[PDB]
Design a protein around this ligand. Structure first.
Ligand SMILES: Nc1ncnc2c1ncn2[C@@H]1O[C@H](COP(=O)(O)OP(=O)(O)OP(O)(O)=S)[C@@H](O)[C@H]1O
Ligand SMILES: [Zn+2]
Lengths: 1117, 58, 72
């Protein structure tokens, strides 16, 4: 409008607030909002203080709260924004709350008067209020937010989620005011109509956080609040909303099912939900299993999806035959990531080839074992059997597959006592062997047992290479491993018969030959074109050669997904190997074939000026399998000589340089063989060091395929390649190489090879430091790092800083794994490397740790926990993780049993009040059981452990994987009961007397305090209220009793009509601000619906309130 | 999972509401810097009441 | 959700009625001291609710003599 910014701040701001109050005359709204912006800028550039401002705070507040009553939405928004910039301390907020300004803010929220910019500043102001001091939040704005979030979805309000987020943020710092006005119920009923996963979980997390700490656990009822989320499943006819559109009744049901599933699978990822749902009483997990044993084919088919995604198992296809759904859950089924364009071989090898770690804890197994034990305790297997027998086929197949998956998980992650009587299946075997029941049940039980055996066979088969490159890689590795440590003749007759019936020589028409006979005549032992000099065999060989050459355009033209495409490639590979089997008679053909292949490759790569672009044929035809021929040719020693006779390796060295075709580098890096040193490793190193960033990334990611396949002599060259890849300019490649090294270091032969070439792993992030800490695990390398003063430099660092950062690291891993947080299918949550765990390994750093006197303070911290704040809980978690990493070997249990701390942890794992540390203790007790002595110690305290490693799939019942579980799972599910925090005259005259006949103060709860105007008279010297025009004391209590009756929501139309008639007849009864104060105090203490609340707030809209404005202008100047 | 301290819970709430809210509001409201129908009913009742009262009921 | 109620399962409503399979009680309404008594053998595990203002169920027992006794 007219800013100067160079004047006396007192006179300037006085003129500003005087023009703001405007005396309700002769001042437009535009200039008033301009003055409000000027006041905002003045408050920004000049610090707020009662000395440098020239006026007390009360005057500013009383001149600012009048802009909220202005009719223009712009002036109201500007006033709210200027009021937000004023609240910076607790005193300013306390004074803003002394005058009942919260009434005006709660009014400004709930109008929805075509203003989505004025309602945003209100929410921002209440968020600033919560930030400044949440212990003083008023109940008026609380009730307003609860009413908006409780009935805002039906009124198409667009600020619903924005209000629920603020309610959830308030419930963390002030739960009493939210539980009193019924905000937790709003939160809990707002998760059953929220399809968005992240919002649904952020909503359930606050309810599960109040149940964690006792001080907040006193604010939630026992078995009626949290168990509401599984009402859509337990209640067959569930009606969430009382008044909904009758047109949408099935879509609403599916939405309720989806939201309830997203909430149920989100309460089982937190410890406060696991413990509160599996309590030993009439819990909410037994009601979920009991309704599964009821033949209702709608709830029964929806509970199986929740059971499937609770255990992170893949869903089969919806069929009626078991043999079709068993094929859809094959661990080796094709995926879209395995395509050449996406993830050619490196992504495929990750799924089928197993991890190199055989003793890492893998916390995911701990969590799944705890969940499975809790589910088996409450009778899940009997319910699954009852679903298998007495149900439809669509559900019988899915329940049989779920039972098979659970039975396989049992004998893999459960301790022997928990899983030595599960494989009997008494309720199913007694049904399959009883000849008294009807025959249908017996036969379907026998069929279920047969399908379970078939599933077990499928599980013990294993995942098989889907592609043909990984197949050759694995076969070559197995052959090398077999041959490193140590049939029919068919002379002339059977050979000729098989050559005759093959049909190759009868006619030259392709695709009509007998390819099985060709394969067997090529693969027979002693047929090698060198001992059987027959002209028919040479004709056969020449015909096959002319067919397989790319220049002839016969094989190189068939498209992918062909009927017989894998067989032709296999036959071609064994044919180019059969040509190599004759080292003296198979030159004229093999040289010609490989020279034609080199011609085709140089033509398609771009080494010619004709087109230099032939990716449209290599990517869609069988001409891309010519790299498999060179692959199966480069394995043999006599093969590489022939491959070098022609310009093959030079062709690949030249192809490595181009920039336009990245698929060719993928094809050549996953086909060659690097078993022996030669020109095959030079191409790999050239691609790894100087190539396109994406090709370089795929090349450095293709080292798991050579690691997990157990290629011989990997520690010689692969480790050096990873070390040189660590110096790459790109960051993703360096991080991937660091991850490959961290995985390869799980073998001692590989860690010794990494230590012998001392790398620089300190200039990287935390991953580099965690990888370098592994050096301490062995004396050769620990003694090296100890000389340069590195162990003592890390001891104090981990003591003061990194002991509390390791817990953040592992919690971040667990959250990214199974909570969908994403800090800015089942993964493997492998335990991070802890320095205390590495120092204990070799008994030399163990004494170095013991002389520092670190075990005593940790034991004292575990014995004397605070459990009041959240920093001390963090310190207790850090101490528990440190103590669990120390007792990970036999040298650690020695210096850990001198203090006798394991009983303390075992007692804390079953008697603590906070449940998050009650789960941390379970993880730590599992980590303790990585040794035989650890399990022996734990057995005395009635805690079982898994005594086998991860080396064999079926270990015979008599280093370990760390997993420990109580003998009775209900021991750690005991929670001490906390009582709820709640257990700790005119209205009758109006019934018989009408309004017109009675016509021929009224404020009940009105005092000097809690009135918008009366509070000012003593503090700010306001002139007393004027006398209104017994004629008006009656209408006052009449409108009061009407607005009171409007709260029950029983008959709202009648009371709305009465209020409308009162406004029509006497438009001056809605002018006394001492009645608006009363009705606002009533709104701030009762449960009004959203439309009724909006109507009540809008009744007092077109009002003037002239006397308050005049008195404010008088006290101002 | 471990979502128990109020800091991680607050960060989760803010990010989940901001990113996954189709309608505008959430990003506007959750800025991390601070870390009429009754009139129509009255008009209808006013216009009706003038026509309504024209007779005497004994 | 009252108009939607049209059938009742005994596993859901009363798990103790479908686990009797034998009783010493006589079938209700049929007992005379000059005839052999008919005992309650079984109860059907499904009831059909009649769509009306009071929704009377349709109970059907199974006496010891192999005859069905339908009640309301
Ligand atoms: N689709 C085909 N598959 C194999 N050979 C083909 C095909 N089409 C044409 N031919 C010809 O057949 C030749 C191979 O036959 P040979 O090994 O010479 O035996 P052959 O019976 O002596 O052949 P000809 O035609 O009688 S001299 C190929 O090199 C081409 O000359
Ligand atoms: Zn007053």
């Amino acid at each position: 409008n007219v800013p100067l910014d160079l004047t006396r701040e007192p006179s300037d701001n006085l003129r500003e607030i005087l023009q703001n109050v405007a005396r309700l005359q002769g001042v437009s709204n535009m200039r008033k909002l301009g003055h409000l912006n000027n006041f905002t800028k003045l408050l920004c550039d000049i610090g707020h203080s009662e000395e440098k401002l020239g006026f007390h705070y009360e005057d500013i507040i009383i001149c600012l709260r009048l802009a909220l009553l202005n009719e223009a939405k712009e002036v109201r928004a500007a006033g709210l924004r200027a009021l937000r910039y004023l609240i910076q301390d607790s005193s300013i907020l306390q004074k803003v709350l002394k005058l009942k300004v919260d009434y005006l803010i709660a009014r400004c929220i709930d109008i929805q008067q075509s203003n989505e910019v004025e309602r945003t500043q209100a929410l921002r102001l209440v968020r600033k209020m919560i930030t400044v001091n949440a212990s003083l939040f008023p109940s008026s704005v609380t009730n307003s937010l609860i009413a908006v979030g409780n009935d805002g979805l039906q009124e198409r309000d667009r600020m619903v989620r924005a209000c629920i987020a603020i309610i959830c943020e308030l419930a963390l710092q002030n739960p009493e005011v939210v539980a009193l006005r019924g905000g937790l119920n709003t939160i809990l009923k707002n998760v059953i109509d929220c399809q968005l996963s992240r919002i649904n979980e952020a909503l359930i997390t606050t309810i599960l956080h109040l149940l964690n700490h006792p001080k907040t656990r006193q604010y939630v009822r026992a078995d009626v609040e949290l168990e509401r989320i599984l009402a859509p499943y337990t209640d067959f006819h569930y009606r969430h909303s009382p008044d909904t559109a009758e047109g949408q009744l099935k879509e609403d049901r599916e939405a309720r099912f989806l939201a309830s599933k997203m909430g149920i699978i989100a309460t089982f990822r937190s410890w406060a939900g696991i413990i509160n749902l599996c309590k030993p009483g009439n819990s909410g997990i037994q009601s979920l299993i009991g309704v599964l044993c009821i033949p209702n084919m709608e709830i029964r088919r929806g509970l199986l999806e929740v059971l499937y995604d609770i255990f992170r198992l893949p869903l089969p296809v919806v069929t009626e035959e078991f043999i079709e759904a068993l094929l859809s859950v094959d661990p080796g089924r094709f995926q879209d990531s395995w395509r050449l364009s996406d993830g050619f071989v490196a992504a495929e090898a990750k799924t089928i080839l197993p991890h190199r770690a055989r003793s890492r804890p893998d916390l995911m197994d701990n969590y799944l074992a705890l969940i499975l034990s809790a589910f088996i305790r409450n009778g899940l297997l009997e319910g699954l059997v009852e679903v298998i027998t007495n149900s439809d086929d669509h559900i019988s197949v899915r329940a049989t597959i779920l039972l098979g998956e659970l039975l396989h998980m049992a004998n893999t992650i459960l301790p022997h006592s928990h899983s030595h009587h599960l494989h009997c299946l008494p309720t199913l075997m007694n049904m399959a062997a009883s000849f008294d029941i009807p025959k249908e049940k017996r036969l379907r039980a026998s069929a279920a047992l047969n399908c379970l055996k078939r599933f077990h066979e499928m599980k013990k088969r294993g995942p098989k290479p889907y592609s043909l490159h990984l197949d050759h890689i694995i076969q070559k590795a197995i052959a090398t491993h077999q041959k490193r440590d140590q049939i029919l003749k068919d002379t002339e007759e059977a050979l000729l018969i098989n050559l005759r019936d093959s049909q190759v020589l009868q006619h030259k028409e392709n695709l009509e030959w007998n390819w099985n006979l060709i394969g067997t005549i090529l693969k027979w032992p002693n047929v090698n074109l060198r001992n059987y000099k027959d002209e028919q065999l040479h004709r056969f060989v020449r015909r096959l050669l002319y067919f397989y050459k790319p220049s002839s355009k016969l094989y190189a033209n068939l498209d992918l997904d062909f009927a017989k495409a894998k067989q032709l490639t296999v036959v071609g590979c064994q044919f180019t190997e059969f040509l190599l089997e004759s080292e003296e008679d198979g030159q004229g053909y093999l040289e010609d074939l490989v020279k034609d292949i080199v011609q085709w490759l140089n033509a398609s790569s771009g080494m010619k000026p004709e087109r230099s672009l032939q990716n449209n044929g290599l990517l869609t035809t069988l001409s891309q399998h010519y790299f498999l021929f060179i692959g199966t040719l480069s394995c043999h020693p006599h093969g590489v000589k022939m491959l070098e006779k022609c310009s093959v390796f030079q062709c690949l060295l030249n192809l490595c340089s181009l920039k336009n075709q990245d698929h060719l580098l993928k094809l050549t890096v996953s086909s060659l063989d690097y078993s022996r040193d030669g020109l095959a490793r030079v191409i790999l190193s050239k691609i790894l060091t100087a190539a396109t960033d994406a090709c370089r990334l795929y090349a450095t990611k293709h080292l798991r395929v050579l690691l997990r396949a157990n290629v011989e002599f990997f520690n010689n060259w692969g480790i050096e390649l990873l070390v040189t890849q660590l110096h790459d300019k790109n960051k993703t490649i360096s991080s991937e190489a660091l991850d490959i090294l961290d995985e390869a270091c799980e073998d001692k032969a590989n860690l010794h090879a990494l230590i012998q070439m001392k790398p620089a792993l300190s200039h990287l992030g935390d991953k580099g430091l965690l990888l370098l800490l592994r050096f301490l695990s062995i004396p050769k390398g620990f003694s090296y790092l100890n000389e340069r003063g590195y162990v003592a430099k890390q001891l104090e660092k981990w003591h003061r800083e990194y002991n509390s950062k390791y817990v953040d690291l592992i919690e971040e891993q667990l959250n990214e794994a199974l909570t969908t947080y994403r800090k800015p299918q089942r993964p493997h949550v492998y335990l991070p490397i802890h320095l205390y765990g590495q120092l204990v390994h070799h008994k030399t750093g163990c004494h170095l740790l013991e002389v520092q006197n670190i075990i005593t303070e940790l034991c004292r911290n575990v014995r004397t926990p605070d459990l009041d704040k959240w920093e001390e809980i963090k310190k207790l978690k850090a101490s528990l993780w440190a103590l669990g990493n120390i007792g990970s070997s036999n040298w650690g249990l020695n210096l850990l049993q001198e203090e006798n701390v394991i009983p303390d942890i075992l007692k804390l794992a079953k008697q603590c009040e906070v449940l998050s540390i009650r789960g941390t203790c379970v993880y730590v007790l599992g980590l303790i059981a990585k040794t035989k002595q650890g399990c022996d110690i734990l057995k005395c305290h009635n805690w079982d452990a898994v005594r086998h490693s991860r080396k064999h799939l079926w270990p015979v019942v008599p280093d370990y994987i760390g997993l420990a579980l109580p003998v009775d799972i209900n021991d750690i599910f005991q929670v001490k009961d906390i009582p709820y925090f709640q257990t700790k005259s005119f209205h009758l005259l109006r019934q018989q007397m009408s309004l017109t006949e009675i016509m021929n103060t009224g404020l009940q709860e009105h005092t000097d305090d809690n009135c918008l105007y009366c509070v000012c008279i003593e503090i700010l010297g306001f002139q007393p209220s004027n006398q209104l025009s017994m004629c008006r004391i009656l209408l006052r209590k009449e409108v009061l009793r009407l607005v009171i009756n409007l709260s029950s929501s029983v008959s709202t139309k009648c009371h709305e009509t009465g209020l409308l008639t009162i406004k029509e007849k006497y438009p001056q009864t809605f002018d006394d601000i001492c009645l608006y104060s009363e009705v606002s105090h009533l709104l701030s203490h009762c449960t009004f619906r959203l439309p009724c609340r909006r109507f009540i707030q809008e009744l007092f809209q077109d009002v003037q309130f002239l006397q308050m404005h005049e008195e404010a202008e008088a006290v101002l100047a | 999972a471990f979502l128990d301290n109020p800091t991680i819970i607050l960060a989760h709430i803010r990010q989940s509401h901001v990113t996954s809210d189709d309608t505008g509001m959430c990003e506007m409201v959750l800025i991390d810097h601070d870390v009429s129908n009754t009139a129509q009913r009255l008009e209808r009742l006013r216009k009706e009441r003038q026509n309504q009262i024209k007779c005497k009921n004994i | 959700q009252l108009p939607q109620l049209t059938s009742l399962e005994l596993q859901y409503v009363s798990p103790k009625l479908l686990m009797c399979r034998d009783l010493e009680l006589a079938v209700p309404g049929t007992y005379d001291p000059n005839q052999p008594i008919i005992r309650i053998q079984s109860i059907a595990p499904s009831l059909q609710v009649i769509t009306s203002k009071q929704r009377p169920r349709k109970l059907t027992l199974m006496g010891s003599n192999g005859h069905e006794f339908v009640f309301l």
